[PDB]
Amino acid sequence: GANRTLIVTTILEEPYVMYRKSDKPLYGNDRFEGYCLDLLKELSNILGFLYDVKLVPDGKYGAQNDKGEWNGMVKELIDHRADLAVAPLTITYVREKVIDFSKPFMTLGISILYRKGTPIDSADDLAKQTKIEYGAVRDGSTMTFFKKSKISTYEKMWAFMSSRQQSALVKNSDEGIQRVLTTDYALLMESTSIEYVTQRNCNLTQIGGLIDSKGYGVGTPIGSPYRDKITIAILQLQEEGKLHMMKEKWWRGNGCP
Ligand SMILES: CN[C@H]1[C@H]2O[C@@](C[C@H](N)C(=O)O)(C(=O)O)C[C@H]2OC[C@H]1O
Numbered sequence: 001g002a003n004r005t006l007i008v009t010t011i012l013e014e015p016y017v018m019y020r021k022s023d024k025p026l027y028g029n030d031r032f033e034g035y036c037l038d039l040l041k042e043l044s045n046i047l048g049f050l051y052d053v054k055l056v057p058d059g060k061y062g063a064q065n066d067k068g069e070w071n072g073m074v075k076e077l078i079d080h081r082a083d084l085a086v087a088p089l090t091i092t093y094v095r096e097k098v099i100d101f102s103k104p105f106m107t108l109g110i111s112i113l114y115r116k117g118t119p120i121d122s123a124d125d126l127a128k129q130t131k132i133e134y135g136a137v138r139d140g141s142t143m144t145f146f147k148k149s150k151i152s153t154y155e156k157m158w159a160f161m162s163s164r165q166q167s168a169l170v171k172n173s174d175e176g177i178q179r180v181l182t183t184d185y186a187l188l189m190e191s192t193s194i195e196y197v198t199q200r201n202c203n204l205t206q207i208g209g210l211i212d213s214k215g216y217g218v219g220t221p222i223g224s225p226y227r228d229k230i231t232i233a234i235l236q237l238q239e240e241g242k243l244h245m246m247k248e249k250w251w252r253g254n255g256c257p
């Protein structure tokens with residue numbers, strides 16, 4: 001009916017969506033905390049809906065496979081299994097063909113996460129060598145950027161990152177970050193996430209600048225009436241200062257000297 005609970009697809013990703021720590025078992029939406037849960041609470045209040053947070057069944061953001069089919073949160077929306085995707089879901093032209101997005105709630109670009117104190121200063125520096133491995137999270141927009149790029153350097157990088165003996169394309173962010181911390185490996189990832197990670201890991205740094213410029217939006221199925229309503233709500237949250245409050249809350253830290 002009109003007041004049905006909305007199914008919200010999302011994915012574990014620090015600090016957007018995390019398991020809340022508790023001495024006792026937690027259940028339902030209370031299992032989760034993070035920037036996206038705060039955003040979802042605000043949207044639910046403004047737009048007057050109830051919601052059920054469900055982790056994406058395949059643990060993927062979404063890419064089109066060799067059969068031409070989508071996976072991840074994008075597929076959950078296409079197949080109407082979810083009403084909304086509230087996650088750091090990158091707005092891209094290819095995704096806009098199959099799902100709708102609100103206007104962006106946060107901006108980002110791809111860059112490089114690596115350790116401090118090395119001679120590696122740019123993507124070019126990584127691309128021209130083979131000792132240091134590098135890659136990206138599988139089945140997301142960063143992977144797709146490299147896979148589809150026609151820029152010489154990024155074509156070379158794609159060829160390398162998709163052809164290592166131990167796959168350099170990692171399952172999720174946490175796996176990639178651990179690889180940067182424990183082996184000679186650099187992770188291509190989004191600047192939002194790099195800022196979070198580098199503040200919590202003072203031996204790590206961003207290498208170079210941003211190599212593209214994009215936004216995150218709330219995803220909906222094509223034609224959903226919630227898309228425009230969520231755009232309006234995001235504008236309200238921005239004007240009120242609430243997006244700034246949420247960013248400060250979840251990117252809080254002591255800095256790195
Ligand atoms: C939310 N940012 C993180 C995550 O973003 C993804 C997913 C992306 N935000 C998407 O919507 O596909 C990326 O491809 O960079 C996967 C994962 O990669 C590490 C880091 O960039």
Ligand SMILES: [Cl-]
Pocket residue numbers: 177196197200201
């Ligand atoms: Cl971290």
